[PDB]
Amino acid sequence: QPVYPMSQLSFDRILKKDLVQGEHLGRGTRTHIYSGTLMDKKIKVILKVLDPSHRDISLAFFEAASMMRQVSHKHIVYLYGVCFRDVENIMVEEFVEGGPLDLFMHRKSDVLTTPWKFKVAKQLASALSYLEDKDLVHGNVCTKNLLLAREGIDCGPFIKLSDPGIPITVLSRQECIERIPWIAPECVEDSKNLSVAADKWSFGTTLWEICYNGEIPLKDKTLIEKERFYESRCRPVTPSCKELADLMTRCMNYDPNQRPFFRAIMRDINKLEE
């Protein structure tokens, strides 16, 4: 177990002068994502830049970074360090060539296969099992946050789970509602309810995305409608794939305590593979 991890992160300090900002690639919750270069020979990197924020937000952003720095798993993105600047705080991560899984699945939906989809699920379960072992919570598990290291269409796919961004702990109620149906319902009720169990629900919604080739669940639904969705205790529509649908259902239990451990999920996944 890490000893003063945030304090350690202060030493991983990356200076702005060693960075080159590349193209804008995407957006997250109060963040912007860029490709970039890290100098000493150079490394291609991803830069996650936090919008100018209050100190409590910056601090939480840094805690997410610290978490990523401490973990070491083949299916979780490596974090090089952070750039500390009051008005421009930056996570510096390895560049994963294949990009976000949601975009990939959209363009390649016609050639995706059953074992391809199952392998992605299994790899994510492996990463979340590791986090569960360490009593760590991610809180932003979704296909947009899964990156393809190996495409595996033509030796299957290889995914890497990206960072959580700003922890749910300090997000506004509106930002939590916006994350429906990925966010665990207890976190919508109160962000203080965040726990390891939250990632089980998210994994369920992530499986839904995989079954539906990166389709956004509840796309075009207003925040009011999303809030009503959990109020009425609904789930996204059952996917045709029984194996993944069954996992999704077990994970999307409104009682956090009843969501199966990832160790159990991994056992179940390996049983199916026999």
Side-chain angles (χ1 to χ4, degrees), residues 6-14 84:
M6 179 81 71
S7 302
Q8 295 177 33
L9 184 68
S10 301
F11 284 120
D12 292 329
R13 192 175 305 256
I14 291 161
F84 292 99

Side-chain angles (χ1 to χ4, degrees), residues 1 24 27 31-33 36 45-46 54 64 82 102 105 114 129 137 149 162 170 179 185-186 195 228 256 267 272:
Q1 181 141 27
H24 186 281
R27 196 166 179 188
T31 61
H32 288 266
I33 308 163
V45 292
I46 286 287
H54 296 300
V82 291
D102 65 335
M105 288 188 302
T114 297
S129 196
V137 190
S162 195
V170 301
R179 200 163 286 183
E186 66 274 18
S195 76
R228 169 188 172 185
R267 171 200 71 213
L272 287 163

Side-chain angles (χ1 to χ4, degrees), residues 75-251:
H75 295 296
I76 298 168
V77 167
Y78 186 86
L79 190 137
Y80 280 100
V82 291
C83 186
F84 292 99
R85 186 169 173 239
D86 29 74
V87 293
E88 190 174 271
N89 297 297
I90 307 173
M91 288 182 188
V92 185
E93 299 161 343
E94 59 169 325
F95 188 92
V96 184
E97 170 132 53
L101 190 72
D102 65 335
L103 300 176
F104 182 82
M105 288 188 302
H106 293 153
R107 71 177 179 105
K108 292 288 175 185
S109 71
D110 282 11
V111 288
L112 302 179
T113 66
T114 297
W116 188 95
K117 287 184 192 194
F118 196 82
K119 189 57 200 282
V120 171
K122 180 183 157 166
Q123 294 178 357
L124 176 57
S126 176
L128 298 183
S129 196
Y130 172 95
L131 292 189
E132 166 187 282
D133 283 352
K134 304 268 179 295
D135 304 291
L136 296 171
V137 190
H138 191 279
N140 216 342
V141 176
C142 59
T143 65
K144 170 193 62 185
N145 278 338
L146 298 185
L147 310 165
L148 270 189
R150 190 173 70 216
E151 287 176 2
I153 312 291
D154 310 271
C155 194
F158 195 107
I159 64 163
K160 288 186 175 157
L161 176 60
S162 195
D163 67 275
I166 301 169
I168 277 162
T169 308
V170 301
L171 292 179
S172 73
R173 201 200 163 77
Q174 178 186 313
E175 286 165 328
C176 289
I177 293 162
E178 184 174 22
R179 200 163 286 183
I180 295 172
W182 286 273
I183 191 169
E186 66 274 18
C187 298
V188 175
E189 293 183 6
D190 193 327
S191 63
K192 299 193 217 290
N193 293 327
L194 184 63
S195 76
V196 169
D199 285 330
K200 274 96 177 160
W201 180 283
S202 298
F203 175 75
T205 308
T206 297
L207 293 182
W208 190 97
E209 290 182 271
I210 288 155
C211 291
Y212 286 94
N213 307 319
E215 182 180 348
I216 296 166
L218 311 186
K219 89 190 105 161
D220 298 354
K221 300 292 184 158
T222 60
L223 298 168
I224 306 155
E225 283 170 296
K226 287 178 170 191
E227 216 194 332
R228 169 188 172 185
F229 191 83
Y230 278 7
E231 170 226 76
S232 298
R233 293 174 138 255
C234 307
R235 284 164 190 77
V237 293
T238 318
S240 280
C241 175
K242 184 175 152 65
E243 286 71 32
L244 292 192
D246 282 357
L247 283 171
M248 178 197 89
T249 296
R250 294 164 62 198
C251 289

